[PDB]
Design a protein around this ligand. Sequence first.
Ligand SMILES: [Zn+2]
Lengths: 103, 50
Amino acid sequence: VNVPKTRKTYCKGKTCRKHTQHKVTQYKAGKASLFAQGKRRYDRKQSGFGGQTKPVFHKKAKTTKKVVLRLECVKCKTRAQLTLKRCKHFELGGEKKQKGQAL
Amino acid sequence: AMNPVDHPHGGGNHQHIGKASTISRGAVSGQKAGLIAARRTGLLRGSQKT
RNA sequence: CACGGACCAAGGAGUCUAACGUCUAUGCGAGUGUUUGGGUGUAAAACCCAUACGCGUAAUGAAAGUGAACGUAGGUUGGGG
RNA sequence: GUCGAAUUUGGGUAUAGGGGCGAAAGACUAAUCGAACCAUCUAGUAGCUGGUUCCUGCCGAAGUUUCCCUCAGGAUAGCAGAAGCUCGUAUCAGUUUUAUGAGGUAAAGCGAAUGAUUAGAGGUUCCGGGGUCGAAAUGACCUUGACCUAUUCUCAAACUUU
RNA sequence: AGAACUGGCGAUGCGGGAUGAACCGAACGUAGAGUUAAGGUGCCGGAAUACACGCUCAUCAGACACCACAAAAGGUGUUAG
RNA sequence: GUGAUUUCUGCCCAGUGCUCUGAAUGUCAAAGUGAAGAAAUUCAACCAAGCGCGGGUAAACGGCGGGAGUAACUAUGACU
RNA sequence: UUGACAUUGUGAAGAGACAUAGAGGGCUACCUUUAUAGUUUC
RNA sequence: GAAGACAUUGUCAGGUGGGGAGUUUGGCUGGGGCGGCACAUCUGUUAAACGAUAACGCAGAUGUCCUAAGGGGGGCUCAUGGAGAACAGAAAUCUCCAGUAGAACAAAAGGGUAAAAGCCCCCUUGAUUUUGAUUUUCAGUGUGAAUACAAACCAUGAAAGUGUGGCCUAUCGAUCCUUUAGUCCCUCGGAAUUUGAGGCUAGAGGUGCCAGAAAAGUUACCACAGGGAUAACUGGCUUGUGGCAGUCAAGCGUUCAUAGCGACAUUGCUUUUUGAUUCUUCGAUGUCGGCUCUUCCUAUCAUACCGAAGCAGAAUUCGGUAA
RNA sequence: CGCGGGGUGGAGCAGCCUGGUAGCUCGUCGGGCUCAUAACCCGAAGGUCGUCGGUUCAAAUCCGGCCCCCGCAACCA
Ligand SMILES: [Zn+2]
């Protein structure tokens, strides 16, 4: 879809508590780390013998994901999140639809 | 002319190899039946070319 | 014209255990439970016993924690006696 | 059929179970082979089949809901019994009456909307197609097509005023 | 084959439909008397070869719901319009 | 693999295999090396075999199909 | 099958990178670079 | 003697690895397979005027799309018909009259909507934040969707008010894990500090068999527990189809409907075709055909006796009693 | 999925690294050549250089994102 590059939501910053500007950026998950209890438990569980020990998911059915608009307040830097409806093509770059022009 | 339990080449509604009979060096005992490690095959056309 | 049964005798299949729910009966009651163990014995019984210990009397929070009366322990309504 | 040899056979010996041996049939390996036999694990597991033992009395069902790799199974609600508990004729009822609502089925309707559908009648084309009089005309005449008006015959589960 | 409402069989005998899980009647402790249901009353077979008005003769008659089949089309057969 | 003798064994290495050069800003493990760190650690370059790339091979496993234009009756196509 | 470490010691040539010096290009960073009193891998 | 600190031997790591090992290889279903999705869903109808309600019943639709097609406000009125204007005609643009929606409002369809919910212009993010209640499906669980509120921060408009996504009914996702935002709080339990980690509240990564295992074939070498809950014989219900038979009479038959035929229709019968079904039988009723032998039926090929002819005779055709 | 490359007339390859005018082969046409036919030569057209943006005196080219394809490796919801 198409969303602006600036967005004005109610803020929760314990000093703002009002409408302040925010900066929108489509959310990327983030590099998975070790040293989280799930990974370390997985490593010991995989090690040795026994083959695979946890399921691996093969019957994928969906073709989209949910685009996450994470917001950054320009006054107090308190970052917030919102979730969108499923879509195929999303892009932050905002160009506005014109109706007078032809197709 | 065998049964699949008895040989790689056995089985099938017709007498045939099914897969390539040219077998690799790294093949294991049980898989090495046929033309071991062949560089070429067919009919010997040409000289030794050694 | 679905299955078992030719006949007879004898055997033959919802039990025991650890932990539990409801109901019931019994005792004592903010307590409760002698029998791990100790004493004793007519001796695997019967009888007696401390310290402990579990459950209840306090719960709510992941937690660090905090912790049960404004009042005749409230008002209104219905209530057996 | 073969019958002087890829011949027949005794004794010895070697080869042991996912192993042997196989001129190849999954054949043979002690009447056992597409994985021998013996004991043990082992009362192996079965949503499936079969059976499941004395009498009388009282009560008395279900094949239906939702979820489940769910469809010969379970869980769950319901139907049933038992124990009762608090009260003592009432905040009751597979019923009627009165008053007030709701509904779009049966019927009905198409000279009402939508859709379908029979027949002619009357009109208009600067603007349908043709034949006649015309060099042509927004000239005229006859016919066919649609168009309009007032009618006419027959209809609808996904049409309808009522 | 699949549904709706209700009643049933399953789980249920008894009288009746000859016979039958489902129809009709009626639901059941052990007996006696009386009266009935549905069905019946020539004989089998308990009960009128009852009474009354008509119709039908069939050289394949007809004879009681569920239910155990018969149609279009025809007949100076016969009856009534 | 085929199955005496006789005779002949045609075309196809794209695919699956097999096998060879390694002339490599391709990929790539453990170790080892460097940077940041207070360390656990993170990052980065580098890097064997193998794969990938490029040759050979069908008496390896196998495969041997369409379409268009054409010859002076048509039809058909030696030709393209 | 391939690599690494250990078994596992004793030396020279060529190549690769660091700390002493250095001619030519950008007070003082680097390349064409060359012998090391020294450290390092093929 | 050869090789030589390389082989070899030991451990770890990457590739290869049906030689071998273990395992898996949906469901519904007029039997299974193929097909399809009736599996998660949505509109109209079946549906029998509350609700509910089945079929692999009927016509379809969904895994999306939209920074506006979301929110607020203002102005205007649509489709179409008629009459007119240079090029300009049936379709360009312009004017008027008529015009209850006969247009449009993303898609499927049904409701709804006209000084709007339609078309154009202006401003903005109310598609925001905090947790509760409630409707639907229902177990009065979850999920999705929605309703009306309460406490903040705003948008628009003069203001009243409206605004918690899309005019409504579909448009979607638990546990564990990982990861992000927030709280910068609790814990790391002999005492401290700092990284690291674990906790707390709200999101994301997804299970389409959609209340959500991690999963390829073959068996004609086969096995077991069962099923007549389920197919392939017979039998039973049915008779489309098969076969046979009627009624009517436009016509053929030179002429003439009916000697013999007979269109368009229509009414039946049979169970000697094949279907449809799934009642019996899967702790088994021996599934082709022929041979042999008996008996039964009539819808009669011959033989008996007859009726009719487009029957001169001959031959033949139609029909009756007759197995 | 982590890294990496490619997209140029109707079809197929050079030109990318060089930042400076887009070349060649087949196809189409016209002209030339031969007394003709064929063949052979020459010229016209043919690639928004996949799309958008940035950098530069200047971008098909270098870089970022997107569409498609390809290579190795990886993958506990
Ligand atoms: Zn703020």
